[PDB]
């Protein structure tokens, strides 16, 4: 196996004080795909000068990210004391197809030093530490987040100047505050800037050595080091796993001042990663050397369709999350928004299913439920819909009545009633869009305003926020064409709005300042 150096000889571990309330801050730093945030450059080829639509692993628009806060440890003001951390080691998430991280989001801003809320300092970029693997469980004292067999550890070291990527069996040490000993909370890594971040001589093993206080490294299959240029530049970094190994991606080597993420390394981990968590970290600084650190944000990746805009230099400088809203689905299909009108039919509202109705001679009350949209199973006949109490149509005693298109019309139940089936009803939608003012209004058609509200629980798209900006202050207005939000009654007559609604109605654009 791989020689990763000796075990720590310390008889005990540093005590770790986990105080989550001090890390309980709100500072979302979301992905805005319109500037291609979080977009990982597609692999295997390149393009330039083009907009394409592509399905692949991407973060989604508006993902704020899980915020990970690293902090100064306890100190007497002369010397460091105990570590001070967030409860991150137990925060085990599904790996699935991977995830991405925003690093240094708050860099160069000034803010809290966390351990002492009234104290602020210039915020520095710190690289995230992770523990990943195929299986997790409990520790011998009942703590969570134990990884089994070989565990992948991503542990930045040297005060953020090297990445140590390794895969070893982590053998817990039994000493005081160690994972197999007395008074264990959570292992956490640390460095001590007073001795570890000396200019020209960083302790490149400071975080490795602290890690080693809690676990011995055994049967290592690998340990690789990557160097990191020290800067405060906003950085994209991320990870995925494929049949060929574990792919480490960053904007750091290819697009440092841009953000497109590119693969820079692959680790030989063929055991599907199912679980991961953030390694808590604390800096053993003193009060007079107490710094603030940027939180990092973790966003998940998933197979999403995006429009990706490639500049002449081949970098993605804009992207569209096609399913984000109704207008965005249209932009992907229609390439852009000023294309013709932007006045197009949009994806409809599904229905929103209710608990089922089941009957079959061969838990309550599922005999019937009237009604809205309920799943059902009746004598082997399945579907979803709303039942209505209605008069019988024949033939009697044959139970299930079907229409001209061979669909179920209704059913004779064992309670003696006949119900008409209307399946589920839905809300059709269309959007009136003005490419000049960059605004819109929407119709629900035939649904009518008695069933319309500014919010919806149906649903047709992930967000309705572009309309809410104005529509949140108006009720729906009912017109002969259909029910509309964002209409404003002005009682005007115009020849052509370039947004006619048909009939004798027209949606008039407002006037640019």
């Amino acid at each position: 196996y791989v020689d990763v150096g000796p075990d720590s000889v310390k008889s005990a571990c540093i005590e770790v004080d986990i105080q989550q309330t001090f890390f309980d801050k709100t500072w979302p730093r979301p992905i805005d795909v319109s500037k291609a945030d979080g977009i990982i450059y597609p692999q295997g080829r390149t393009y330039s000068n083009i907009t394409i639509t592509y399905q692949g692993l991407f973060p989604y628009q508006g993902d704020h990210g899980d915020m990970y806060v690293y902090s100064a440890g306890h100190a007497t003001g002369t010397t460091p004391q105990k570590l001070f951390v967030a409860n991150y080691s137990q925060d085990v998430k599904q790996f699935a197809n991977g995830f991405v991280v925003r690093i240094g989001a708050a860099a160069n801003s000034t803010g809290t030093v966390i351990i002492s809320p009234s104290t602020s300092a210039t915020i520095r970029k710190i690289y995230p530490a992770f523990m990943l693997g195929s299986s997790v469980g409990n520790f011998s004292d009942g703590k969570m987040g134990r990884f089994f067999n070989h565990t992948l550890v991503l542990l930045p070291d040297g005060c953020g100047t090297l990445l140590r990527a390794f895969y070893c069996i982590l053998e817990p040490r039994s000493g005081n505050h160690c994972p197999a000993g007395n008074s264990y909370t959570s292992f956490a890594t640390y460095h001590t800037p007073a001795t570890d971040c000396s200019d020209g001589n960083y302790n490149r093993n400071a975080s490795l050595n602290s890690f080693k206080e809690y676990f011995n490294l055994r049967n290592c299959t690998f340990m690789y080091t990557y160097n990191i240029t020290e800067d405060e530049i906003l950085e994209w970094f991320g990870i995925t796993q494929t049949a060929q190994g574990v792919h480490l991606f960053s904007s750091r080597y290819v697009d440092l001042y841009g953000g497109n993420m590119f693969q820079f390394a692959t680790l030989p981990v063929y055991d599907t990663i199912k679980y991961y968590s953030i390694i808590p970290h604390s800096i053993r600084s003193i009060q007079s050397d107490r710094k603030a650190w940027a939180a990092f944000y973790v966003y998940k990746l998933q197979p999403l369709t995006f429009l990706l805009d490639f500049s002449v230099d081949g970098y993605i400088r804009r992207a569209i999350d096609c399913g984000f809203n109704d207008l965005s689905q249209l932009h992907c299909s229609y390439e852009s928004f000023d294309v013709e009108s932007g006045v197009y039919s949009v994806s409809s509202f599904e229905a929103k299913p209710s608990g089922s109705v089941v009957e079959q001679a061969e838990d309550t009350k599922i005999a019937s439920q009237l009604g809205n949209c309920v799943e059902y199973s009746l004598y082997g006949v399945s579907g979803r819909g709303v039942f209505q109490n209605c008069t019988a149509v024949g033939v009697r005693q044959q139970r299930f009545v079907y229409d001209a298109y061979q669909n179920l019309v209704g059913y004779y139940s064992d309670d003696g009633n006949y119900y008409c089936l209307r399946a589920c009803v839905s809300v059709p939608v269309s959007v009136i869009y003005d490419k000049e003012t960059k605004t819109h209004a929407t119709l629900f058609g035939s649904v009518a305003c008695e069933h319309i509200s500014s919010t919806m629980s149906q649903y047709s798209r992930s967000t309705r926020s572009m309309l809410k900006r104005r529509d949140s202050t108006y009720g729906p207005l009912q017109t002969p064409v259909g029910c509309v939000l964002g209409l404003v009654n002005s009682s005007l007559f115009v020849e052509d709005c370039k947004l006619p609604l048909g009939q004798s109605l027209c949606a008039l654009p407002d006037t640019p300042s």
Partner: antibody
Amino acid sequence: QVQLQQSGGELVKPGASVKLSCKTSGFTFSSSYISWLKQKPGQSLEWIAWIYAGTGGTEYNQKFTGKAQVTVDTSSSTAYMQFSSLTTEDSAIYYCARGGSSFAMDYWGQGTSVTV
Amino acid sequence: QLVLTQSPASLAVSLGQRATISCRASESSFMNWFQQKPGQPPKLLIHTASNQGSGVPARFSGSGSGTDFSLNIHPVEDDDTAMYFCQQSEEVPLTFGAGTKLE
């Protein structure tokens, strides 16, 4: 009052195994580290192993690996030290103590005399 | 582990007099002192260079840092005839020095 009570001694031949024990009281066994040490007359003391009774976690002195096993039975508040394949160089007084890791050894058993 | 050297090898101190016993580490501060009376296991006297152990008389006062540690027994009783040892608990394997004989 904390007490550590060891078993009496024994005479064995080389190749023999011996099992030592140390029953303790006056403290919670499961909250303490119990260390085992080897000492010969005229010599300093050498630590063999410790066990945290509360987790069963252990640590050993490499000169005894493959020969020594430290274990506990918390239901009887007892620490044990098992040795196998003893040689004449293992004739010693074996001691149990309350302490281990970073904890100083405040309480000791009387010592168990094993002659090989 | 850490190797410890003690000095003096032995010392005679009369009743009512102070006994100074020193230890020097080969390297570097959780140094503990023990007293092993003839026929007894070692008892802890000092821990973490200067603190008193459990049930330990004020007569036993320690100090030290780095590689250099000491114990001052004052007054010495005839009943303090014992081996005095330094032990290092900072690192594992835990170790004891050769010992100083106080008479």
